[model samples]
Target: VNPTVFFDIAVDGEPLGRVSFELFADKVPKTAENFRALSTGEKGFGYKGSCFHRIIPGFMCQGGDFTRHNGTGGKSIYGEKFEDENFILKHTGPGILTMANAGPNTNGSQFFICTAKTEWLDGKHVVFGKVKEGMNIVEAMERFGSRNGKTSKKITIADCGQLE
Candidate 1:
């Protein structure tokens, strides 16, 4: 099943526009379920604002730190799990969303969107979704890049709600 998520991103109460992504549920069931929970408010993964702490041009933008005061945070450091080859989702092209992790699994909450073809990241991070709309906004944000010389951008998820 493919589920689309419309993300309304903001920074410090400033609107950064909305981004819609199509999730590959059949490819990654666990990850898809987790994202759905966050979006539906069944879970609070994004309730607290978490900034996009890392951004690499021509690569991807990273975020989802639960410790941060921003709403883009994630859960604690969970244990890593093996990647299921059955869910063969590759990170290719811009707007491709994938879970960020330290090692194999260890993916609690934290994802990145590729601005270019990031084939090198294949088998490294779990690809779950792709931006169907608002790719322009995402590109603009990536172009703006990180602030304070740090790979950090104040991107907030605000509150996830049903798409009307």
Candidate 2:
């Protein structure tokens, strides 16, 4: 599908540059709504300064836990955890941005960008978007991310500007 909305994540301190994502607006509505709001600062404070707090090479780079830089804090603009919007999508490949949660329906503000196939996470995590550009940046985060702490120069989602 031709997604009208895209999220641009800027890598402040790496050659990885900027990573963009095509929001799956049609496939995942509520999830996309939360993601868009958080990414663009439309409501709850944006993800302009949040860091990719976790990194597992050959797996994913997780962040968006704006409340706590370590991936334990972050609430959706919805104000609380919500139901899972999965089943229609799968964790197919690299650059896939999916909601990170404690379990089913625990979706808050945390999310992960898969740099590799995580088939097991297919039905569990909400896949709201995928890399529209910059897989290299996603990969670079995986390769050099500051796991369990703040990411370098605070690699954050600068904007998730959606256009009609």
Candidate 3:
């Protein structure tokens, strides 16, 4: 079965809500596992305290750079980087969970969730999962987005872990 995980979202250090995701483990095993590991902190480092460094209202909200709390850093449990699992899943619509990278095979702990139907991202990003619930929380996040990829307020993953 696919695994489900969550992020306790916060704005300016204040709790907002939780955003849970259901990973398509069967379709993107390695990619899903990487996300899972980071969520649960099974590797001793994870998404906790990481902020969504990039946010575009009509596009996606990007985060998971726990190391820098910015877009420039984060590492996979496998190493500093890992290969793109596959582009089997498409960015069919909003709330899609996908890996973000500089290019092919440069994946790390970074990921993004579509705030809108981002079909243009298909094949370019590895879609491994989708938000199982809390689309409203994502909507709330959009209010702080900018056209320049920077956020207006600090949107952080206050806490995160795998759901039983």
The model with the greatest TM-score is 3
State the lDDT of candidate 3 residue by residue for 1-164, as single tens digits: 79999999999989999999999999989989999999999879898888999999899999988888778899999986888777888898989988899998899988889988898888889999999999999999988998888788999889999998
- lDDT of all predictions: 0.69, 0.75, 0.90
- Writing each residue's lDDT as its tens digit, candidate 2 over 1-164 gives 53545445666643336566777888888988887777667784867667776777777888887787777799988778999976688889888888888987898988888888889897888888888777776766675655453445556665556555
The CA-based lDDT of model 1 is what? Answer: 0.69
Evaluate model 1: give its TM-score: 0.81
Indicate which candidate wins on lDDT. Answer: 3
The 10-residue segment of model 1 with minimum total lDDT is 76-85
Model 2, stretches more than 4 Å misplaced? 1-16, 146-154, 158-160
lDDT of 1 by residue, 72-93 (tens): 4356322333343233888768
Task: List residue ranges in candidate 1 displaced over 4 A.
Answer: 44-48, 69-73, 76-87, 146-153, 162-164
* Candidate 2 lDDT score at position 157: 60
Q: What's each prediction's clash count?
A: 9, 0, 0
TM-score for each predicted model, relative to the true structure: 0.81, 0.84, 0.97
